[PDB]
Each structure stands twice: as C-alpha cells, then as structure tokens.
Design a protein around this nucleic acid. Structure first.
Lengths: 52, 147, 128, 124, 52, 187, 52
RNA sequence: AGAGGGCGUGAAACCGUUAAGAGGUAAACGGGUGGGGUCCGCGCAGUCCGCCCGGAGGAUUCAACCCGGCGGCGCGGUCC
RNA sequence: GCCGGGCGUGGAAUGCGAGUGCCUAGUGGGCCACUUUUGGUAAGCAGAACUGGCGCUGCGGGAUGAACCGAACGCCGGGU
RNA sequence: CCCAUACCCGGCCGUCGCUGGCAGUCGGCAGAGCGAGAAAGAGAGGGACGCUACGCCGCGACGAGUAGGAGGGC
C-alpha cells in the first residue's frame, strides 16, 4: 500500500503514481444478464429453428 | 517480427510484388530529390508549392534566446495559481485581488484568448497585447509590467 | 467384437487420388508436394483440358465426416497414460493413437488402460 | 471473477492441450475434460468433480464450498461413494438437483460417474 | 550489423501497469493453477509468512 | 453466367474490436446481448461505437459536454460517451453530472466528483438503464486531429487551404515560387 | 470490489497466527494480459547481447 | 564389422544384381475402369445398450427410523 | 436577404441501399473484329472514331488455330 | 436425334450477405409459448444434446483470373 497505494491514497514511495482505473466495475456478466433490471427489457427469445 | 512482414507471403511469386513488365530496377527516376525543375516537376508543384527560390532577409548570427517570448492565453491564466487562490478571492470581501506572476510560471507575453471569471487580478507579466489588457481591465484588474 | 463408434456415416470423398506437382514425374528434383504453377504460359495454371488438376476449395470434404477414419472415429495422439483420462468421455467419437517414440514398456500400460476406459486404440499391436 | 478469469485462460493454460483438430482441458474438476466455460473447474465458484476412488472401487464426488474461495486447501470437499450403480447415480443426482448446485451439470456428471463405474467393472 | 536496434523502451506507467496486473493475478487461486503451480493444498493463496 | 460485379459485395466494417482488451471484450459480450434482444436502437449505436478504433472515438472534453448539457430539454438525462472524458482547464464552474464513459482522466474525475457529480461505467449503465432511456449519446470532435489539415485537395491548387508537410517552418520553407506572386505565380 | 478481505499471516510451522493483514488494493487492479504480454515481450529484449 | 584404419549416421543422381510386369507410333502424364501383385484388415459366422416379463441362484439387503459427521440455501418475511 | 405561417395523392415508366474519407500497388510497348474512316496500287501495312473482344480465359463448335460462332469456370449426379 | 464447365433440379465445399438466431440449461421457490398477414400486455389491483460467445446454429445468393492488393494458415 506504499509502493502502489489504494485508489484514494496515492502511492507514497512513488512520485505521483496511483493504481489504474477499471473499465467496468461489475465484471461477471453472468450475475448481470440474469438480473430483473435487464430481464424486464428484453423481447422474448425467438429460438424456434426454421429450416428450409 | 519478420514473420508478420509481407515478404513471407511473396515467397513463390516470381516478381516478389514488383511486377514483371516494370521490373524493380536500381533507380528509375534518379537518386534523392532529383528532377525538381525537370521530370518530377508536377510532384513539386502539386505537393510542395514554394519549394524553389529565395525570400526575405538573411539574418546571419541568429541567437534564439533573444527572440524568446512564450505566450500565455487568458483562458488558462488561473491555472498558473492553485485552486486555493482562486476560491479565496471570490470568498474574500475586502476586494483583495491575488497577483498572478506570469514570469514565475515561465511565460512572458499575455494574450487574451477567451473569457475570464469576474474577479480582479494583478498579473505581473512582461508583455501584454491590446485585447489582453482590455479583458483584465474590464474584469476589474490591473496590468503591471516587470522586467 | 470391436468398440463401435457412436454413428457410422457413409463417408464420401470428392477425390481420392493425391495432387501431384506439375512435371513431378519428369524430374527427381521436382518433389511430389503440390506447388501452384505461376508461369505465364503454364498449361496447368490456365486449366487446359486433360492436364493435372489444381486443388480448389471445391474438393472440401463434408464437415460431418472431416478428419474421420474409415472406422468412423477421429484420431488423437497420446503420449502417456495421463493423456488418456481426457478421452474417457468421448469414447464413441474419438479414438486414441499412441505416439511413435513411446517405448515398448510404456505401450503395454496404455493399451490395457485404454481397454479399461473402453477407448479404442488404432495402433494397439505395437512393438510388443 | 469467473467470466473475467476465463478470458485469461481461454487460450493459455497448463491444462489446455490442442492437437488433431481438437481441444481439451486436463483440469482436475472438469468433467468431459472439454475446454468450455461451463465445464471449467478452476473458473467457477461452484464446481462438480467425479474422480475414481483411491482404492479403485467407487467414485468420489468433489463439491466446492462457497466460504473458502481463495483458500484452496479447504475449498474442495470430497465424499467417497461405494454403492451399487443405481444407488450411486441417484446419490450424485440428489446432490445436484436437490441442492441447486450447477443443475446444468447433473446429466453430464451422471455420464462421467457411470463411465467410471463401468471401468471399475471387471474386464472381459 | 552490431547497430541493430536491440533494446526497447516502455513507458514508465505501462511498466507499473504490468506489475499491477501481475500481482493481482497472483491473488486469484485459479490463474496460479493454470500457470502450472501445484498449489492444490496451500492454505491461502496470498500467502504471508512471519518476519522470522 | 450471371451479369453482376463482385467488386463491393463484401461490406467493409468492424464486426468485433481489433483490441484484445478483455475488459473491453467483456463489455462487447454484454452489449451484443443488449443490442439484439432489445428493440432499442441506442444499444446498436453503442455496440457499433465499441468496435471502433481510438482515432474514431476521439476524447470528449469536459467543457464540450457542459456546453451540450446546458441545452434546454435536458439537465436530467445522463451523459453517455463511448470515448474518454478529458478535463478542460479553461472552464471554472462545474454543474453536477451523470457521466458514462469508457475511461475518465484522473483530473476529470476529481473535478466532476467535487461538483457532486456521478461517474458511471458501461456495465453500470446497463443496470441503471438497459434500453438507454433518458441518456444523451455524445462524441468528441472526430476531425479535430492534426492530420486532417493535410487532407482534402492538394496544396499548390486554387483555393486549397491545406497544410503541406514541411520538416520545419520558417521564411525559407515553402515561401517561394508556388506562394509569392513575385516568384512565378501563386494560387 | 465493494470490500477488501482480510489475509492471515502464517507462522514458520504452518499454523495461522492471530494477526490479520488487510488485502492491499494492488491485488484488486485490472487484469490485463495484453499489457503484460506487451511489456514482457519488450523488456526481454533489453538483456540481449549483440551479435553480427 | 550391418563400426575393419579417410572407419559415426550413409540420402539422391548413377550402376550392378535378384524378384515382378510390360514392350513396333520416343518416353512420361490427366481422367476412367479392368487385371495382377503387395501387404494389411490379426476378417471368417457377426451388434451391443437400457427398460420391463419368465425361470433358476447368491447376498447381509431396500424403505422408513435412531446417533455422529460434512455440505447447500435462507425472504430468520425484519437472528445476533 | 431574413423571419413567420399554411399546404404530402412524394407529382413519368423501370431497376437498385447509398454517401464519404484516407492509404495505395501494378500499369503508362498493346493487339484484333463489325461499322465509320485518313495515307497507300496494295499489304497479316501505317494512323484514328465507337463498341466488344484478346492480353488476364479455360469450355462446346469452326479438322488445325491468341481474336471467329456459342457460352464464361467451386466439386459432383440427373435432365435439357 | 447428338452434347458444353452454359440453363433447370439435387448434394457437398467455400466466400459474401441477412451488420440473421442463441446467455431462456429461467424445473415440487418447477408448470415446458413467443411462425404471429395487420402500431402494442400469455402484466398487476423425476426431465437427452448444448453455449472452445474468438462458440454454435439457420437462411438466401454467389464462385474465371496474369500484374497487383489483402485475409487465414492446428
């Protein structure tokens, strides 16, 4: 915590370094795609297969 | 990476990506920037206009330090001082205006490129423009010279 | 008495002969491996009648039977007994093949282990 | 997390082996040994693993508890089963179906256990 | 020729970025397995021992 | 024998990002799902913009989005930009903002959050607004790069105010014959 | 990372002592193999000897 | 010694020999079949897999309970 | 030249998704034919116009054939 | 009446397109649908396979090639 520091406490033993930021907080999209917020805004899966 | 280059995919192909008719000879058009007034005339008119000729006065012993004058715009003028300075003036009620020493930051000339927050300053610069002086006066500040 | 595969479909190949390099018969320096002729007058290149055939993608085998042995299996090279526990769940689709440099004392450990796991081996009767 | 770590090991891991136009994973708790997201044992928080018994008779079923997630010494719980074929299948079916523990793996783990039990059946 | 460009230079922030991404993956008990390491019995992955 | 031209039947467009960034590649997995199972055409634009190269998603300045959010029928909606939000030092006051960008510079976080704002990421955007309802999708200045000042008609052409490529600028670099009416001609 | 868990220090003989160290925030940094594979295959070129 | 004093491995061109086949439009080749060898198929009485019925067995034997242990989930509608 | 307001039966037929910006290789010896056509006694000659060919192209036909007539090519079975 | 690598029909390969479809494997916390010509609501007061998502699947159309260009090479 002194060579790289937390996100809100810059590293003490570096000049002005701080940890990189995350491009997406909630990483596991499995826990995302099965959420009531998403699952209410989706059209029904058209999975009946249509062959020639 | 030689394994990513094009020559790996040209193995087997005879001319190696340079044509059979117009083979890859040594120097078809001449070496360097040749033929400026000649067979390469169109390329120099169409893409380097003004390449040929002289204009102006030949200044002999140019010492770049004499003509040194790095400008600063009024847009980023308050960035030369800390945010504590900028807030403590709009909070101050005595009309006490902070002094921005431009020369200390590294610039010499002040040019007025944009808006200013309406709170007075006394910019300690070395050169000013006309419009730059107007903005600082119109806000309510002063323009002090220094050498 | 063999370990029959899942399904044994009729394999059908669009071509069974190899493709030979042009003029590979007339020379010994010209090896049999296919090289596309790039000459400007080459007959084979410009598809003349009654010449050597150039391989196109139109000869592609069916994806349902691609890489499939005549025995209805698909090979998988195996080096030791530990590389067999992979194939214990593909018994009816993927056969096992012991690699060349596997010694004779290690081959008679793989084959009966592959007899326990019911995996077919394509080279069981080895050096022995 | 699970979806994250899969991207790190989808194509570079010591358990992945690719040859003969196929792809396999030699992971410990990876029934079907397939290089898949569903079947990877290292990735998920709840995995199922069916290995042969240590003596050579029976199966052990490996579940992964949810408490110890970065403590691998205690995470995996193993239960040795040595019963008949219809009873061993029903015991590992109830640990999955009636515990809601990867219910998309009940039939897949039943095949592996049945395949192990048939292996431990005497050879012809 | 001896003056082929052998040495390469990388930005100091990316050098520090790679240390961050390397240390964080040494905290997931799954990536350390896939790197090969036989740690199926180690007590806790970010293993810390005494100063003794 | 069919009388057609196969010249341009293979449409040139990105179908997945050339970047190998797995966090970026995880977002695309999320928005590929949202693009095809919601009729909202918002997610299709965000999906298309996640594929693009950095030169096609230029940075949005901080003052530019302030300029576009002070427009009337707004100031409750959320700022969504696929590029990155850089801090603009030439603006003084900062309204409170609800921002969703791929990456926010360290100073632009501290200046937004000090104004009581809110910074979102695209996984949190889908949780708070799946169909993109109540958002304003913005983009930085695409042709603001220095490169486009060399494009267009060639210099040395009538009314072709195009920057030429010169190794250094001075009184004796492309100030002669093509430019002065006293030296030959000019355009 | 809504929280940082608590790591336990182990003694010299394998037991877990009473102390507990907070997980440093560097272990929560983003996992970027593309950067690691970039930096590694450009810093390995700096120990290289010339040959000609 | 199938390592025999320029001797590890011992390729091709080329040559000798043996075995097989052929032979008046130079040879060689493409496509298509046919014949003949070559070895291989360890080919030669040809499927196993469930499920239920019928007939002969053999176990320590099912269900439901009792005690111990481990695990999962908890909207305990709001546990500490 | 500005505002402001009002009018869609989308004001010929047919067909087809378009617009747009970078970077850019090869080429810059061509040749033939119907028709028009200049020089020449004429030429498988020299020089042009328009369109299509050949070059970069196999295939069926003209015995043979760079260009003629038909028709343009993934690998196959049937029909025409 | 004869036959081309042309046309029709059928198979297979590949490319291109639909910027096509699939996270819904939602199971005694269960109830098996979204092929439906018609801008919108099955709204509340013990059970095969699968989905290396850089994966899998379905439809159409298309396929000559020197110089040259690019893509993929388990």
């Amino acid at each position: 915590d002194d060579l790289y520091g937390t996100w809100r406490k810059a590293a003490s033993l570096k000049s002005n370094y701080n940890l990189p930021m995350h491009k997406m907080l909630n990483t596991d999209l499995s826990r995302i795609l099965k959420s009531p917020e998403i699952q209410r805004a989706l059209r029904a899966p058209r999975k009946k297969i249509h062959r020639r | 990476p030689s394994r990513l280059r094009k020559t790996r995919k040209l193995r087997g192909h005879v001319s190696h990506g340079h044509g059979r008719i117009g083979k890859h000879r040594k120097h078809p058009g001449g070496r360097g920037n040749a033929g400026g007034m000649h067979h390469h005339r169109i390329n120099f008119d169409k893409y380097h206009p003004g390449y040929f000729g002289k204009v102006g006065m030949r200044h002999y012993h140019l010492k770049r330090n004499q003509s040194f004058c790095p400008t600063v715009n009024l847009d980023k003028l308050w960035t030369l001082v800390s945010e504590q300075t900028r807030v403590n003036a709009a909070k101050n009620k005595t009309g006490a205006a902070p002094i921005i020493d431009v020369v200390r930051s590294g610039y010499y000339k002040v040019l007025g490129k944009g808006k200013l927050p309406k709170q007075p300053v006394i910019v300690k610069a070395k050169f000013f423009s006309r419009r730059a002086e107007e903005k600082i006066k119109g806000v309510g500040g002063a323009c002090v010279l220094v050498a | 008495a063999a370990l029959r595969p899942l399904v044994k479909p009729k394999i059908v190949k669009k071509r069974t002969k190899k493709f030979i390099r042009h003029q590979s018969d007339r020379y010994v320096k010209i090896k049999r491996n296919w090289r596309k002729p790039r000459g400007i007058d080459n007959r084979v290149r410009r598809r003349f009648k009654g010449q050597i055939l150039m391989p196109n993608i139109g000869y592609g085998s069916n994806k349902k039977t691609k890489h499939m042995l005549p025995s209805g299996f698909r090979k998988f090279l195996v080096h030791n007994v530990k590389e067999l526990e992979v194939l214990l769940m593909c018994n009816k689709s993927y056969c096992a093949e012991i690699a060349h440099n596997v010694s004779s004392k290690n081959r008679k450990a793989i084959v009966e282990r592959a007899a326990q796991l019911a995996i077919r081996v394509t080279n069981p009767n080895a050096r022995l | 997390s699970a979806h994250l770590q899969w991207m790190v090991v989808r194509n570079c891991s010591s358990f992945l082996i690719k040859r003969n136009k196929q792809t396999y994973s030699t992971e410990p708790n990876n029934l079907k040994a397939r290089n898949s997201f569903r079947y990877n044992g290292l990735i998920h928080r709840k995995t199922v693993g069916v290995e042969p018994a240590a003596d050579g008779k029976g199966v052990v079923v490996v579940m992964k508890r949810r408490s110890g997630q970065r403590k691998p010494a205690t995470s995996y719980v193993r239960t040795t089963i040595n019963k008949n074929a219809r009873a061993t299948l029903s015991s590992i079916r109830h640990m999955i179906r009636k515990n809601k523990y990867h219910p998309d793996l009940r039939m897949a783990a039943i095949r592996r256990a049945s395949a192990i039990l048939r292996s431990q059946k005497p050879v012809m | 020729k001896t003056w082929r460009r052998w040495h390469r230079r990388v930005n100091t922030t990316q050098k520090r970025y790679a240390i961050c991404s390397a240390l964080a993956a040494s905290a997931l008990p799954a990536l350390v397995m896939s790197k090969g390491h036989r740690i199926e019995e180690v007590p806790e992955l970010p293993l810390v021992v005494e100063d003794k | 024998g069919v009388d057609i031209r196969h010249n341009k039947d293979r449409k040139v467009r990105r179908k997945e990002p050339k970047s190998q960034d797995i966090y970026l590649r995880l977002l695309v997995k999320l928005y590929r799902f949202l693009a095809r199972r919601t009729n909202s055409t918002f997610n299709q634009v965000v999906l298309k913009r996640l594929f693009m190269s950095r030169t096609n998603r230029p940075p949005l300045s901080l003052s530019r989005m302030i300029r576009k959010m002070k427009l009337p029928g707004r100031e409750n909606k959320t700022a969504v930009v696929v590029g990155t939000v850089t801090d603009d030092v030439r603006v003084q006051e900062v309204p409170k903002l609800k921002v969703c960008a791929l990456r926010v510079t360290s100073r632009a976080r501290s200046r937004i959050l000090k104004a009581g704002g809110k910074i979102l990421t695209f996984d949190q955007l889908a949780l708070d607004s799946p169909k993109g309802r109540g958002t304003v999708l913005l983009s930085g200045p695409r042709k603001g790069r220095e490169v486009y000042r060399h494009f267009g008609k060639a210099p040395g052409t009538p009314h072709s105010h195009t920057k030429p490529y010169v190794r250094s600028k001075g009184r004796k670099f492309e100030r002669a014959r093509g430019r002065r009416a006293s030296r030959g001609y000019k355009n | 990372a809504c929280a940082r868990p608590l790591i336990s220090v182990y003694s010299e003989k394998g037991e877990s002592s009473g102390k507990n160290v907070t997980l440093p925030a560097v272990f929560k940094a983003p996992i970027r193999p593309d950067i690691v594979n970039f930096v590694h295959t450009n810093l390995r070129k700096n120990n290289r000897q010339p040959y000609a």
